[PDB]
Amino acid sequence: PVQIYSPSLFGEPALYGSTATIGQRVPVAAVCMQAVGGAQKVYTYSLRELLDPVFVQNGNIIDITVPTYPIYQKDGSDYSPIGDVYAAHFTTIGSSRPVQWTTVLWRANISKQIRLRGHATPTDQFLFFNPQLSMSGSNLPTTTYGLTVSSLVSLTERQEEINAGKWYLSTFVAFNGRREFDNYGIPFYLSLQQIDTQQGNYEPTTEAYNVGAMLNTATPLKLHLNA
Amino acid sequence: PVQIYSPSLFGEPALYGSTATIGQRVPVAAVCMQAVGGAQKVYTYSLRELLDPVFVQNGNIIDITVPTYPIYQKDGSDYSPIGDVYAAHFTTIGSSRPVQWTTVLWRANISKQIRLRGHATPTDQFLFFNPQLSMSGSNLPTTTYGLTVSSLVSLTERQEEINAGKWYLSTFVAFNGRREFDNYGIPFYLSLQQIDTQQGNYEPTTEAYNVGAMLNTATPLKLHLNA
Ligand SMILES: [Ca+2]
């Protein structure tokens, strides 16, 4: 595996999860990941710049760009490649109400405006594990994580800028979803039902740190290379 | 300036702030930072182990051990050294209600049980910038940070184990406090008043990520060397 880190931009949002499919509905415009040699697809609105990443393997800084699979945009009925994925990692978060989180590291190969827009009927929800300060009695606090699920919305049309050569994170998450496909052993999940916006706390996992689903201090990303 | 990152242990709490002083009251047992050329001191119960840290300076992994100042424990009236500080950084988060935050990287020089015990009268409060998913209408969410302040408590006696050779983070924070002293340029602030548990949101800063006051994705700590 590759350990990944980078300074964040001023006010740059943290990684999060989005869903945009209910029944047969799909978003009008979104970031798409289709399986190699397959027609299956998942969607996302997650697009996070890595301002200046650093890649580390087995304690040594390496150059990832010295077997990739592309990442597309869906723009209406028109899919188009926007970059290539170098590493990805998946993990199941939770027990009786699992959240499947797939993070992919990719480098844009075109400097373009990426349109995001949900289906006209509200279908778009967003997921985040918000770190909380937990106190039981008069002891040292710990960090718990709650699952924040936004209410259903129809994502207003918007333009997001990507630049050739830059690195980007993109999650593909699902709430109690199905195994749609996998790419080089990394599964990709999809859920098709509205998510109850009332959710409890989720026990932390060391893989949720690796995929970036739960924030922690000085904790780098850690994904599998395409192999 | 050194970038630091590390994988977190299973469920390891994220960096938080602690205050333990009101008026002339000081904790019974806590981690102490003394001015290199003075008798001034600040206190904390923050003590977070870095499982397997990596230090990066100007793009390259470095061995930071090849001018340090000690970090002590206060145990009753007794003070004793427990480690040596290799890097530190300071920043203020907020305008009308500022929070002074100093993070110090240090390596333990003894393996023993460190005593934490607040004053008998409640004096201990803890502070955390909890990352939140905020949504304005039907648009992409952002990450805001609220200021979680625990209620006044008297920290129950406890023992925290440290091991010589391991790396530990420790914060020294204040809520609209005074600059007690500085160690190799990095100021250390102290607050001597109970903190109102009702607080608002704090706008992001790049320094908050570097010192680790606000969590972000794949974002390392970045502290100054001792010079
Ligand atoms: Ca002693």
Author numbering:
A (entry chain C), B (entry chain B): 425 to 490, 494 to 654
Sentences from the paper on this structure:
Astroviruses are nonenveloped, positive-sense, single-stranded RNA viruses that belong to the Astroviridae family and are named after their ‘star-like’ appearance when observed by electron microscopy (EM).
Porcine astrovirus 4 (PoAstV4) has been recently associated with respiratory disease in pigs. Therefore, we could not determine the spike domain boundaries based on sequence alignment alone, and instead determined the spike domain boundaries by predicting the structure of the full PoAstV4 capsid protein using AlphaFold2. Size exclusion chromatography showed purified PoAstV4 spike protein eluted at the approximate size of a homodimer, which suggests that the recombinant protein is folded correctly. To further substantiate the folding of the recombinant PoAstV4 spike, we used X-ray crystallography to determine the structure of the PoAstV4 spike to 1.85 Å resolution. A trimmed AlphaFold2 model was used for molecular replacement. The PoAstV4 capsid spike crystal structure reveals a homodimeric protein formed of mainly beta-strands, similar to other animal and human astrovirus capsid spikes, and consistent with in-solution studies with size-exclusion chromatography. Interface analysis using the PDBePISA server reveals 4660 Å buried at the dimer interface, with 64–65 interacting residues in each chain. Compared to other experimentally solved astrovirus spike structures, the PoAstV4 spike has the highest structural similarity to murine astrovirus (MuAstV), as seen visually with a notable beta sheet cleft at the top of both spikes and by their high TM alignment score of 0.809.
